[PDB]
Design a protein around this ligand. Structure first.
Ligand SMILES: NC(=O)C1=CN([C@@H]2O[C@H](COP(=O)(O)OP(=O)(O)OC[C@H]3O[C@@H](n4cnc5c(N)ncnc54)[C@H](OP(=O)(O)O)[C@@H]3O)[C@@H](O)[C@H]2O)C=CC1
Ligand SMILES: NC(=O)C1=CN([C@@H]2O[C@H](COP(=O)(O)OP(=O)(O)OC[C@H]3O[C@@H](n4cnc5c(N)ncnc54)[C@H](OP(=O)(O)O)[C@@H]3O)[C@@H](O)[C@H]2O)C=CC1
Ligand SMILES: O=c1ccn([C@H]2C[C@H](O)[C@@H](COP(=O)(O)O)O2)c(=O)[nH]1
Ligand SMILES: O=c1ccn([C@H]2C[C@H](O)[C@@H](COP(=O)(O)O)O2)c(=O)[nH]1
Ligand SMILES: CCc1nc(N)nc(N)c1-c1ccc(Cl)cc1
Ligand SMILES: CCc1nc(N)nc(N)c1-c1ccc(Cl)cc1
Lengths: 547, 542
């Protein structure tokens, strides 16, 4: 073989990039890609004030060392140099401009061997314990003479540019700051053919912005308790049911990722599990699906708003549906007048007649969600009736229980009214919501009996995450977790090709949801009280590509 | 000497033991322990006809080899004195193996004996005269691992001479006639390191456990550490629960036994649960949202780390099916599950001043058979009133098996205040695929210590019942927990329970003649081969 310099001396690059203030030349239908995150700095300093989580991450990565692994690292390097043979520390290299941006109390960077690249400055110009080098090659010379774990290139742009340039980077620890700031310096555009993403972290919120961490890798080129594992799997199937009908070769990017910790993967992995292990069934006359039974997803609303990023989604419609529910409405015309067609097909003359609702007016969806939420138990008449003080106002009741009896285990909202089922345009999919309160934080579990993974679920996750935010707010609580329990989870065969494409896309840090803070009652929300900020997503996809 | 013979030459023991019958009692024991499983053979052959899974397991283990790991041992071995494994058995044992299957293929067969014509068999079939002579035969061969296949006499000698590093023990959870037994294993000398998943093979459940002698690439490895840079150092309640008390639990490497889905939740709630003085002043540790799945086709999930009785919960189930709400019916059968919820004082505090004692209101049974009807009293005739959900789900399962609307719901929002108390088991949803029925039950409130164990058994039984009257085979029972909690008063008992190793699960047998959900009677249910640890009082309050 022919050892590569970056491999022998373990040279890595670590950075943090925000989005750049681009000029809206006429289309807000912005096209997003990895290059969306490229802002490095502005006016000699970072573009942002303080994002402490990234600092913590930066410090942890650049200071972490594994002494037990060094003995191996040393041998490799000496062998490479043909020179067969104080806590261990990592080396950090940075441009002069980067060095000058660091506050005096933080330089030199603690527990790290600091190296600075410069031409205009010499060792005499520095009081600190640091190594000065005037050219990339000197670093390689220095590294061959030092005892260190790993080497991290900290920037700036010029420094990144030349290192990536000479392919002296083994991996790029890239922090994606999902917010926009003014920038004058940028990270070099990464050659998609020279570097591939191999891992994505969980998403977090720090100093009013979400962010995640991804890793780019450079293109290709007791043991007795380990056998017990092999024995215990003596009775496993070599393959997966639909493997031959799906072909893993199609999920190259998806399978090539080592660490998939981004929350969106809970959704993506379920899609994958169903495609590979789902049972073939025939739900509605003709149409076919792949199905599984029993899944659970958890989204941390305090850290992000889980709006899928591997495809484009709009929320105006589902928000109006939600306000429609809250108003206790069952009149489909209200949504149609706002150009929301979610329920249009379930309210036609033909659809109603086939549900045996011959005496139901067009678009009168019957005692569905809204009616059940505000009047469960009342006798449904028509969509124009005034059901004031009729039935059980569940909504009002759960809000009251959350405010005065937070530890109660009976805080549930249920739409599955067994008596009214046949009067509904169709039985509800979202059976119930149960709330949980701890230390001023509100969590919600929603049980879905039937789940269309390809089309519905994406919207369903958003609907209830927003609802949890709304309920938390009017009860003076902070949103915590939104827990989605899936009963019959299916993938329509018509969606397969589209989901294959989606599964090979890498998620972007999630966006955030902002609610007008003045709203103190669940019934006072209007469409303009909701704001989805920093939504970065891939190209929209039609689940079924029929034409 | 830091390590001895067994560790040096890697000598393992592999066996399969069934339970033994006694001319004293039938199939019901009083006390159970690891020695419960000790049946090795009967009249020169195995106690049982055929258990193909154990045969498959035995074969897979005795033949498996990892050549890229050999020299690691070879080095250590010599530094003391197609790669295959070595198998040692007694003559009597060798005599039982059939001709066509003898000698054991792909393995180095050795026969410990005293009177064997070493010239009557090929040289590929080694023979030793004494236990301590095997160490000599190993120092000359190229083998990966050495497996002692018995028999009883052989095991005994090897165990006494402490030449056993590990014991791959198959627990056959059924009884047979035996005349030979496995030597009682000294717990002080050996400890269970791993327990597999539970299986059913040839009409018996069994699992595999591993005994261990008490000794008393990197690229993405660092990346793993970086992604955990924000993870909490210690566990929320470490100090209060003290993980050191769970030595056995923590000492187990592989915990694949289904009972661990339950046990792990207990552990997770203890270690990470949120302290909440929820109700009555009584404290609890709570978490939100868990899911357990049990394979009813392979076993009945009746907890074995403690003793559980089922007559009570079966009668409750039949009571639900009859659509009853009369607490007295149960009390007169000494089923007191609902007694506290039906007293004058409890009803009055529920504001049910006009409700008769033990008249629980429109609860489970009423909703199951009459959802929507107007509840009057527990004695009224409700025939043809309200929606009969039970009848409907059964018809849906039979006539429209792929329906995604097969739900049985007890949470009738309109009747909640009229019930002695709102249902904990909100609903059941069914799934039918390839002649198999699965069930999901969503529980809003879960008392991990007392309730959940019974809840699991209760709905597993119900799944079997529905499946049978629909001519389907039961598949999975899926348990979804909402507010999952451990009462503080149960903590010490659960600590004890968490350190007990599960036994292979029992099986449930229903009278096969019952084909209508309403025709079941208490005598139609039987639990078989229930092996369990001694009962535990969750509330140790004397
Ligand atoms: N968010 C993030 O992850 C990062 C943000 N930044 C930001 O970007 C800005 C700095 O980036 P940038 O302007 O490109 O400056 P750099 O930090 O990259 O420094 C460039 C300078 O360093 C020296 N240098 C670089 N290469 C060599 C070489 N081969 N030989 C000798 N000397 C060399 C020279 O200094 P000299 O003049 O002495 O000759 C040169 O002018 C700051 O605003 C900073 O806050 C930077 C890195 C990461
Ligand atoms: N379920 C399971 O996992 C197992 C079941 N079994 C069952 O148990 C029965 C066999 O056990 P068992 O009756 O004890 O007979 P064994 O298989 O243990 O063989 C005993 C005989 O082997 C030779 N032998 C054993 N130890 C020594 C020694 N130290 N030195 C010299 N020779 C030795 C002697 O034969 P010789 O007469 O030539 O002197 C001795 O009489 C069978 O019915 C079999 O099916 C056995 C093992 C495992
Ligand atoms: O909010 C919703 C509403 C519907 N569906 C899907 C699930 C099923 O694919 C179909 C409804 O069919 P039934 O389960 O009612 O048969 O719509 C969702 O995923 N989310
Ligand atoms: O079948 C049952 C019935 C009750 N409980 C428990 C859960 C709660 O600890 C208590 C009911 O109290 P509330 O959740 O209603 O407050 O009983 C179970 O675990 N299983
Ligand atoms: C804490 C910011 C930060 N986060 C990440 N992920 N990478 C980096 N390279 C830096 C960084 C930028 C400039 C200097 Cl001068 C030092 C470090
Ligand atoms: C397949 C039975 C089996 N299963 C297990 N788990 N262990 C064993 N030691 C044997 C066994 C019994 C008698 C002979 Cl002669 C050979 C092997």
């Amino acid at each position: 073989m022919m050892e590569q310099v970056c491999d022998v001396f373990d040279i890595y690059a670590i950075c943090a990039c925000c989005k750049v203030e681009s000029k809206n030349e006429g289309k807000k239908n912005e096209v997003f890609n990895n290059y969306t995150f490229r802002g490095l700095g502005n006016k000699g300093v970072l573009p942002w004030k303080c994002i402490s989580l990234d600092m913590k991450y930066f410090r942890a990565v650049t200071t972490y060392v594994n002494e037990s692994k060094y003995e191996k690292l040393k041998y490799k390097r000496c062998k490479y140099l043909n020179k067969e043979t104080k806590k261990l520390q990592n080396v950090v290299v940075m441009g002069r401009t980067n060095w000058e941006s660091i506050p005096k109390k933080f330089k030199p960077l603690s527990n790290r061997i600091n190296v600075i690249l410069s031409r205009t400055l010499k060792k005499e110009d520095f009081d600190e314990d640091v190594y000065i080098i005037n050219k990339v090659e000197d670093l390689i010379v220095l590294l061959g003479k030092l005892n260190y774990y790993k080497c991290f290139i900290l920037g700036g742009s010029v420094v990144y540019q030349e290192f990536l340039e000479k392919k002296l980077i083994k991996k790029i620890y890239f922090t994606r700051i999902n917010s926009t700031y003014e920038c004058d310096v940028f990270f070099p555009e990464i050659n998609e053919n020279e570097y591939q993403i191999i891992s994505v972290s969980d998403v977090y919120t720090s100093n009013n912005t979400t962010l995640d961490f991804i890793i780019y890798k450079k293109t290709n080129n007791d043991d007795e308790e380990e056998d017990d594992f092999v024995y215990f799997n003596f009775n496993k199937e070599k393959e997966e049911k639909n493997k031959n009908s799906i072909h893993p070769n199609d999920f190259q990017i998806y399978n090539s990722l080592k660490y998939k910790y981004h929350p969106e993967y809970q959704y993506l992995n379920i899609i994958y599990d169903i495609m590979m292990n789902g049972n073939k069934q025939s739900d509605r006359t003709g149409v076919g699906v792949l199905s599984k039974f029993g899944y659970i997803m958890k989204f941390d609303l305090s850290q992000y708003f889980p709006l899928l990023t591997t495809k484009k989604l709009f929320l105006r419609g589902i928000i109006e549906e939600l306000l429609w529910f809250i108003r206790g409405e069952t009149n489909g015309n209200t949504l149609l007048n706002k150009n929301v067609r979610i329920w249009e097909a379930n309210g036609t003359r033909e659809f109603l007649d086939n549900r045996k609702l011959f005496h139901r007016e067009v678009n009168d969806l019957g005692p569905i969600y809204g009616f059940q939420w505000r009047h469960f138990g009342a006798e449904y008449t028509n969509m124009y009736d005034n059901y004031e003080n009729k039935g059980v106002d569940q909504l009002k009741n759960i809000i009251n229980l959350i405010k005065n009896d937070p530890t109660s285990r009976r805080i549930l909202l249920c739409a599955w009214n067994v008596k009214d089922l046949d009067q509904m345009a169709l039985p509800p999919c979202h059976i119930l919501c149960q709330f949980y309160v701890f230390d001023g934080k509100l969590s919600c579990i929603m049980y879905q009996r039937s789940c269309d993974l390809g089309l519905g679920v994406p919207f369903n996750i958003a609907s209830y995450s927003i609802f949890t935010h709304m309920i938390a707010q009017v009860c003076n609580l902070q949103p915590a977790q939104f827990i989605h329990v899936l009963g019959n989870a299916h993938v329509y065969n018509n969606h397969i090709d589209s989901l294959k494409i989606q599964l090979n896309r890498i998620p972007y840090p999630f966006p955030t949801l902002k609610l007008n803070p003045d709203i103190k009652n669940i019934e006072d929300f209007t469409i303009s009280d909701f704001t989805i900020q920093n939504y970065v997503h891939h190209e929209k996809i039609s689940m079924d590509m029929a034409a």
